[PDB]
């Protein structure tokens, strides 16, 4: 996990390692009941002891609700009064054990205990190496969701009174003996009260802490960090609540006649930024309003304000990593796009509104077969389009979002595939005639679909609705699966796998696409950050030139894997952390042995034991039929699709090995070099090497404005 028995109150992480674990498990062997029952027994194996002690640390509070009491030389007892510090206490020796642990260390230990208790009670997969064989503590941008580099040019011990906004006096030395301890606790309390609910947990790393000095020195002497003290700078790391990551106003207490103590600390904590605003329903409360920006978050703005106010006037604040990430995401050519946040979906919802108007019109048209269903299935309808949909921007390849138009059941369909497609074309012709005769403001034309092989008469209806949007209606009936199964039956033994690929393309276009769309839209609403992560991942694949041969639904699945199963990491709370988690996973993926099994759900319908083992048996059958993977590389499966081939079919083994090699080169780059603007720029530069030839081409017209950026 990354903890240790070291001191954490000096702006460090740890406080809990071998010794604390032994004393704690000895106390839990002694007992630990609410009426001094025993929780762990002598005859238990190490699995039982570990499950018990982690169940205890997950369930019981030891910092804010209660405390534990035992005697070493008769029984242990939990009591229900929190002492605002980690409190396991021995009365036979009158000690508190975990005073090296700060509140943030105990909070992160609580969250890790909950996560590993969940992974212990997980019965479906094998969670063993998932728990014990993945040191996540290597990259701080993969361990914590927001990193902040702040520099503190302090000066000298007597220059403290000028270089600080706080005061380190006599009783301050008594309570917080070392300056590092005092400044660290000051930053924790200031940043915690400033953020409030926009963070789940906090951590303050003191970069530059040398715990070693020679015999000829009185203490650890240094000159780094603009002063003579044992740190280079401060790394402020935040585990962020993603739903309240971007609430615009920071609500405080209400307004009575008397200035309350809480509103007094609010006013003396915000100064000029505070105000008193009357809201839409009529409440009168204090709040400090900010402004959203695409390139940088309100967390950065507020921690800049807080540290430059209540710490010093000399500190420097930075996260250019996430600044450049938000810059690398595209920005649509729309009014107020700059101040627009990254979680805004207003363009998508405007598209959906226009679609619903068209949906009503075509639903109440009059046809020989009445319409049964109309299902939007587009990438914009699942928020995974790369460029956000701009009105009248008709050069983006995702301008025409696919809708399925399905009529009622009828026994009088033709039973010959070409004439069947021609009958669907006849229905679309009547629809187009009625539209151009009734609702002339809409415009329309007809195109072809050659994505399905050997079915060459698939005609789609392009409709341009006057809010600037395009939909290509394609018709799905109750006879397509029947005719494709009959064709693949009557085909001879040589051409059967060709029609297998044909039917599989048909399924992935028409049938499982609808299930895919509704599932991803629902779980995206539960996971906001999935849409910026998948947009950034699609941008990365496009600049590395793999998107032309890898389909967008596979891109979305391989993007959403860490959101669905973030074990043993956390749920991503930044575009940076999400994208780098995706890169680390796709680098560590050994697809020749390991299949991808997902359960696309909201957080705590899941794939139970029988379905899971059946999918794994499908996988091992595929690997017995193909051990090396010259025909299939990625075996991805979910509840809507237990097949395992349907989205990753027809993929060149050069392309798959190139993708895994690019991920490995990327993660080795981040291993050898620190994460910064030059590293991410090198990440986004295209390769253009390992290719036997390259052909550079230009268009006569630049297409940025027409694409809507």
């Amino acid at each position: 996990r990354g903890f240790s028995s070291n001191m954490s109150h000096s702006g460090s992480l740890g406080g809990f390692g071998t010794f604390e674990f032994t004393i704690l498990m000895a106390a839990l062997l002694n007992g630990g009941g609410i009426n001094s029952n025993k929780i762990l027994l002598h005859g238990f194996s190490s699995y039982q002891l570990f499950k018990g002690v982690i169940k205890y640390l997950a369930t019981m509070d030891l910092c804010h609700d209660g405390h534990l009491q035992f005697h070493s030389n008769p029984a242990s007892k939990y009591i229900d009064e929190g002492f605002q510090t980690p409190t396991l206490f021995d009365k036979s020796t009158k000690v508190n054990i975990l005073t090296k642990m700060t509140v943030s260390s105990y909070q992160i230990l609580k969250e890790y205990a909950g996560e590993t208790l969940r992974m212990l009670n997980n019965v479906v997969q094998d969670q063993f190496s998932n728990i014990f064989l993945t040191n996540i503590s290597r990259f701080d941008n993969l361990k914590y969701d927001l990193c902040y580099d702040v520099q503190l040019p302090l000066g000298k011990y007597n220059n403290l009174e000028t270089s600080l906004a706080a005061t380190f006096g006599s009783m301050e030395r008594v309570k917080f003996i070392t300056l590092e301890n005092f400044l660290a606790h000051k930053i924790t309390n200031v940043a915690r009260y400033a953020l409030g609910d926009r963070i789940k947990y906090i951590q303050i790393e003191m970069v530059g802490q040398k715990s070693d000095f020679p015999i000829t020195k009185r203490k650890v002497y240094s000159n780094t960090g603009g002063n003579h003290f044992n740190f280079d700078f401060v790394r402020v790391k935040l585990i962020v609540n993603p739903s309240e990551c971007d609430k615009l106003v920071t609500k405080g207490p209400a307004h009575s006649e008397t200035m309350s103590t809480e509103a007094a600390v609010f006013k003396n904590f915000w100064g000029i930024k505070s105000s008193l605003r009357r809201f839409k329903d009529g409440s009168i409360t204090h709040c400090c309003v900010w402004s959203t920006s695409s390139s940088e978050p309100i967390i950065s703005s507020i921690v800049n304000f807080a540290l430059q106010k209540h710490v010093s006037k000399k500190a420097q604040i930075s996260n250019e990593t996430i600044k450049k990430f938000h810059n690398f995401l595209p920005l649509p050519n729309l009014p107020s796009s700059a101040k627009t946040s990254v979680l805004n979906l207003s363009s998508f919802f405007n598209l959906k509104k226009s679609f619903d108007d068209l949906y009503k019109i075509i639903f109440q048209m009059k046809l020989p077969l009445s319409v049964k269903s109309i299902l939007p299935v587009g990438s914009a309808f699942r928020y995974t389009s790369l460029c956000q949909p701009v009105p009248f921007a008709y050069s983006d390849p995702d301008f025409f979002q696919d809708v399925i138009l399905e009529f009622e059941t009828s026994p009088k369909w033709p039973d010959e595939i070409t004439s069947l497609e021609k009958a669907k074309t006849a229905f679309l012709l009547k629809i187009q005639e009625e539209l151009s005769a009734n609702s002339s403001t809409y415009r329309s034309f007809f195109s072809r679909d050659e994505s399905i092989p050997y079915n060459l008469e698939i005609v789609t209806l392009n409709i341009l609705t006057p809010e600037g949007y395009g939909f290509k209606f394609r018709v799905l009936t109750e006879r397509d699966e029947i005719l494709y199964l009959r064709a693949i039956a009557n085909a001879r033994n040589e051409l059967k796998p060709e029609l297998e690929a044909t039917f599989l393309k048909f399924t992935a276009k028409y049938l499982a696409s609808v299930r895919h769309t509704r599932t991803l839209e629902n779980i995206s609403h539960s996971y906001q950050f999935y849409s910026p992560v998948v947009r950034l991942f699609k941008r990365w694949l496009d600049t590395h030139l793999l998107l032309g041969h890898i389909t967008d639904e596979l891109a979305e699945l391989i993007a959403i894997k860490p959101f669905v199963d973030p074990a043993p990491y956390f749920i991503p709370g930044s575009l940076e952390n999400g994208f780098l988690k995706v890169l680390k996973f796709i680098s560590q993926w050994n697809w020749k042995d390991d299949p991808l099994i997902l359960d696309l759900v909201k957080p705590e319908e899941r794939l139970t034991l029988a379905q899971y083992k059946g999918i794994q048996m499908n996988f091992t059958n595929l690997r017995n039929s193909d051990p090396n993977g010259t025909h299939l590389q990625f075996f991805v499966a979910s509840k809507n699709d237990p097949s395992g081939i349907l989205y990753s079919s027809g993929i060149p083994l050069p392309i798959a090995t190139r993708l895994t090699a690019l991920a490995k080169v990327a993660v080795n780059l981040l291993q050898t070099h620190g994460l910064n603007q030059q590293t991410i720029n090198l990440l986004f530069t295209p390769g253009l090497k390992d290719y036997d030839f390259v052909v550079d081409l230009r268009t006569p017209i630049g297409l940025k404005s027409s694409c809507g950026i």
Binding site: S45, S46, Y47, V123, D126, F128, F132
Partner: peptide, 27 residues
């Protein structure tokens, strides 16, 4: 089942992490 798989896996990790009497006697 959980008992069997976790027991075999902790046996693997303990034989991986186990130290040596030569180091013990030297120290």
């Amino acid at each position: 089942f959980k008992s069997n798989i976790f027991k075999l896996q902790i046996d693997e990790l303990l034989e991986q992490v186990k130290l040596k009497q030569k180091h013990v006697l030297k120290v």
